[PDB]
């Protein structure tokens, strides 16, 4: 797994195409999303991922609140992320860690959102230009 | 070389504290850039790319262009960015390639910005969400 982190002024997002056949369901308010003072996790999840979910999970999970206690952001959005590997998972794979990723931010109290899987996706960013406000993470 | 390639609405951005201690020297008003309509190219040099700063340039320069016709983008943008490689660049090598990607995309004739190397920089981007919006190359 990949990771890119970015301390955001704000990140916003709206669904336009599908890129999968059938992608993640949706309601049309999961449609646009929002977060102000936002850790935005990109993450692309590796076909090597496959042969430990829950490690790579617990990984990622721990990895991510660390530079969100470090920036002191509340605020943490993940981002399914094709763009940092060109080893991707199945799709399968890549939603189970990205669902677990997401209910173990919840678990560790942050305020998380997350983009829906299997779209192409218009979105706008302000990131932070501070030393910590870019980050990347290997995480195997 | 590792490349990211975002088609963008818009790209701005704000130069804040030196990350190097003698960083790119810039004017007040290379502390602040917008384009509209731009692939921005976010391009991480690598170590690996010492071998050879021509041909590495050559590449990128060719790989950035197909983009930009084919996106039907008139505006570029380079982006010295550490976040998609492990194996960075001494920053004479970077600065080098960077240059020549910067000389070669405008001798195609495309409308070049650049951000200055060596900062902390704060930005704002709108990213299109259409299949060809965000990409990712590897050169070498």
Redesign the interface.
């Given at each position: 797994m990949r990771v890119?982190l970015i301390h955001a002024d704000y990140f916003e997002y709206?669904?336009?195409?599908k890129?999968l056949k059938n992608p993640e369901p949706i309601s049309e308010d999961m449609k646009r999303g929002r977060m102000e003072e936002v850790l935005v996790a990109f993450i692309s999840v590796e076909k090597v991922d496959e042969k430990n979910p829950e490690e790579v999970s617990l990984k990622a999970i721990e990895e991510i609140s660390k530079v969100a206690e470090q920036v002191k952001a509340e605020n943490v959005f993940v981002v399914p992320w094709?763009?940092?590997s060109?080893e991707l998972a199945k799709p399968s794979v890549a939603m189970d860690i990205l669902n677990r990723v997401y209910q173990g931010l919840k678990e560790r109290g942050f305020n998380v959102g997350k983009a829906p899987f299997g779209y192409?996706?218009?979105?706008?960013?302000?990131?932070?230009?501070?030393?910590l406000?870019?980050?990347?993470r290997?995480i195997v």
């Amino acid at each position: 797994m990949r990771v890119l982190l970015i301390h955001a002024d704000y990140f916003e997002y709206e669904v336009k195409d599908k890129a999968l056949k059938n992608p993640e369901p949706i309601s049309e308010d999961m449609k646009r999303g929002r977060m102000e003072e936002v850790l935005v996790a990109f993450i692309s999840v590796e076909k090597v991922d496959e042969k430990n979910p829950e490690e790579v999970s617990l990984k990622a999970i721990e990895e991510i609140s660390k530079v969100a206690e470090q920036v002191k952001a509340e605020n943490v959005f993940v981002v399914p992320w094709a763009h940092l590997s060109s080893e991707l998972a199945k799709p399968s794979v890549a939603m189970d860690i990205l669902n677990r990723v997401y209910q173990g931010l919840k678990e560790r109290g942050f305020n998380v959102g997350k983009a829906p899987f299997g779209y192409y996706i218009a979105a706008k960013i302000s990131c932070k230009g501070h030393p910590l406000a870019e980050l990347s993470r290997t995480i195997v």
